[PDB]
Amino acid sequence: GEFNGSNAKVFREGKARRLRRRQTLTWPTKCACHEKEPCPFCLLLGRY
RNA sequence: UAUGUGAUGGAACCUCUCCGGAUAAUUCUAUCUCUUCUG
Ligand SMILES: [Zn+2]
Helix, strand or coil: CCCCCCCCCCEEEEEEECCCCCCCCCCCCCCCCCCCCCCCHHHCCCCC
């Protein structure tokens, strides 16, 4: 996935913003995942 | 009743300090009671 960037505001009427503070895990990359046919993890996340 | 590519809040002991204490022989004698009718 990506797990970066984003524009979370933790509210619709305030800036504040919501961000991570811990470490994100990794796994080796296999197959092709893109906009047309996202992998199940990206489909759940909806990063595209 | 959220709004979405990002939430270690299991991420914090109502904790700390303070003699239910102090004083006292289970002992012992003076009355009580008010209206009587000329005396
Ligand atoms: Zn993917």
